[PDB]
Structure formats: structure tokens, C-alpha cells
Amino acid sequence: MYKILEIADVVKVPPEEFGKDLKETVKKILMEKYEGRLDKDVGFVLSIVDVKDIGEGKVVHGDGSAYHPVVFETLVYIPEMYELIEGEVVDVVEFGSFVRLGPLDGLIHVSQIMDDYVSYDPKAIIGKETGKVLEIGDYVRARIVAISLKASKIALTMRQPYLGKLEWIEEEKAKKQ
Amino acid sequence: MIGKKILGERYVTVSEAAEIMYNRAQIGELSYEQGCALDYLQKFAKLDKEEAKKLVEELISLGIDEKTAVKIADILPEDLDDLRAIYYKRELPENAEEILEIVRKYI
Question: Domain named S1 motif: which ranges (chain A)?
């Protein structure tokens, strides 16, 4: 899932920046501090969208920086258990297929791709009885079955009804019409 | 932790997130992961931001929770089976058909 969060914080502005635009300076500091961070509860911080409020600066002894209370908005990516997702296969190995979900990828272990005997062809995952094939570039619909975010592993499966490579789903619809 | 406290949140569609990331890329170079996110978002956004947000609003007007409305807007289900995929371990909505009509209505 993707979310926009409203966050209250206190931003430290060094004296070397006192001549620059306050909002731009605060935004830059927030970007350097939080973008790229991965939090188990919050998710992956993708962007500091905007700074919505900046209070008066406070100065504490022994410190030359100005501490400003602020409220900023941020876009985050957060995987959720049992979530239905759609993504692109970016790597296929003998033990599974990696699927891009945004800034993070999920892994469909080789035994969770399809209900069939599969084999990895060094020269895509192929089903022996169905002929179904999964290779880099394919779009898939899957479900998250395991999450381990470390400030990482996201496990995916398509071995449930209504899941699979998009083309397989479209074919099923055609037959059922 | 991220900030002193999270005041509130809003689930957003992939379509809207894609435009938000597009704007971020206009103010500075993206990291590798931010770049992957932009690529993913642009490829899986099935509507522009305006339409996606309009769809979510319509679905919410029917009493559909925010998270689910967003997921529906992201997936754009075409039949009952697609809805069954979304409503995992959940009973299908009594308004299942109306949802499909609206989705098949982003038009």
C-alpha cells in the first residue's frame, strides 16, 4: 500500500543556513534525514512531499542551531499482510521470482508460482504440465504472505485462486466468460 | 523514529503516488530505490491522478472503507472473481455489482 503521512517534528537548522529560504532549507534537511529510511511500522520513506508548517526557532545553550517545530507531509510505501498486489517480475532464479512492488521487491518462492511441476530454464520458470511460463518483465497479481522489514524480506504467492501472471488471469476469464 | 509523532494518514492510489513521485523527481536526483518506485508507480497506475481520486470518492460514497476503495481503484476489477481477490477472507459486498459498474465506469 501507499500512504501520505502528516508528521510533527523538530528540525535543526544550522547557522550556516540562516540566509537561505527557511522552508526550502527545512525541506532539504528533512529529505536528507528521512528519505530512504525503512521503518517496520511506518514503511519506506519515498518523499518529503511538502512542509506544511514551520514554527519559530528555539535556541538552546551550547548549540548554535535553530530548532523549529514543523509539520511535514511524506509519501511512504508499506507492505501489509495478506495484501493483494500487482507488480513486475525483475529477476527469475531457480528458487523463485522477484517482483517489484515499488522501492522494495517481493519474492515468489519457486513452489508458490503455480500449481504444477516447475523447472528453472537458465536460457524463466516453466510448468511441465501446463506450459505456463513466468519470466522477467511479466506482470503478476499476487498476495503478500510474509513480511520482515529491517531498518528485508517480503514473501509472495500466486498459488491461490484469482492470482497469477495477468495473462493467465485474463485467459481464465475468457474461458469462464 | 520518523518525527516526533504521526498526526494522521491517508491511503493513496498508485495513480496519485505516481504523480507525487514525479514531482519529487523534478526537484532533485532520485536514489536507486526512489527511482524503482517511480518506475513501478508509472507502470501500474491505471488512471491519471484526477480520475483515480474521483473513483475512490465514488466508492467511498457507497460506504466502502478507504483502504479497500483505494485497492479497488488500483486493481480496477472487471468481474466478481477480481473482487473476491480483493475481499480476501472477507464476504463479498452486497453491492458487488454496483462496484463493477462504477469501475467499468471510469468513463
Answer: 82-159
